[PDB]
Amino acid sequence: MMEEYLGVFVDETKEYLQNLNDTLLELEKNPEDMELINEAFRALHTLKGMAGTMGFSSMAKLCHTLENILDKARNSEIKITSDLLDKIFAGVDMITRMVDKIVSEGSDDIGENIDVFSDTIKSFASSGKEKLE
């Protein structure tokens, strides 16, 4: 059978999420080393792509969201305030839940809320209270 292509595709995404949690959980203790920010901004960028080729963009958008905070972190827009990373680790949390159901059935539909979980984090950083009247 030629199904081992997807069996290895996930075994790599899981070993990377941890490697990406070690980077993001070490990033919290070192949210400015610029190594955990690039070690994560990358894996998440690679994890997001692997989630698009799997037909699970709902879980890939989560990989792009986290990497987005790691992007502003590398773009000088945001920094790991222990909250932008908590929601990020929260995205990797659902990404795992989808992987647990995707592995149990292959569906990334966990009633998650990307546009929301991202807007929550996207608004949790760039803010402009009181603007133009």
Side-chain angles (χ1 to χ4, degrees):
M1 258 154 193
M2 202 237 283
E3 54 164 346
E4 176 174 322
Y5 215 92
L6 70 107
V8 171
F9 248 133
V10 186
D11 187 5
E12 280 204 64
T13 211
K14 272 124 109 269
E15 288 196 7
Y16 247 44
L17 287 158
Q18 123 161 23
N19 238 359
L20 163 66
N21 251 22
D22 251 308
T23 297
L24 281 169
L25 82 82
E26 287 176 42
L27 164 74
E28 89 179 57
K29 310 144 200 271
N30 308 113
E32 3 165 11
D33 46 34
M34 257 278 185
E35 68 184 333
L36 300 197
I37 289 182
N38 233 40
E39 272 213 354
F41 165 97
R42 283 181 175 234
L44 282 151
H45 194 102
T46 258
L47 255 165
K48 159 191 91 74
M50 288 200 317
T53 277
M54 293 272 120
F56 305 162
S57 283
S58 321
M59 173 206 55
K61 290 142 74 146
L62 291 162
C63 296
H64 191 256
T65 263
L66 275 90
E67 157 259 316
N68 222 283
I69 285 71
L70 307 202
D71 192 332
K72 282 148 265 221
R74 124 174 204 140
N75 229 85
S76 233
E77 288 270 290
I78 67 82
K79 63 129 269 217
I80 280 59
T81 62
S82 226
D83 223 81
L84 304 195
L85 114 78
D86 174 74
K87 292 313 203 270
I88 251 145
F89 167 104
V92 154
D93 214 311
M94 318 207 291
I95 264 167
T96 289
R97 295 325 204 178
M98 289 149 104
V99 154
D100 172 52
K101 116 222 227 81
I102 277 183
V103 158
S104 199
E105 327 200 314
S107 328
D108 66 64
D109 292 89
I110 51 149
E112 60 172 357
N113 222 149
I114 316 324
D115 258 312
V116 165
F117 266 113
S118 117
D119 275 46
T120 258
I121 245 185
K122 257 117 246 215
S123 278
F124 255 139
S126 252
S127 73
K129 252 213 102 119
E130 208 227 52
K131 168 235 288 199
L132 219 118
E133 302 168 11

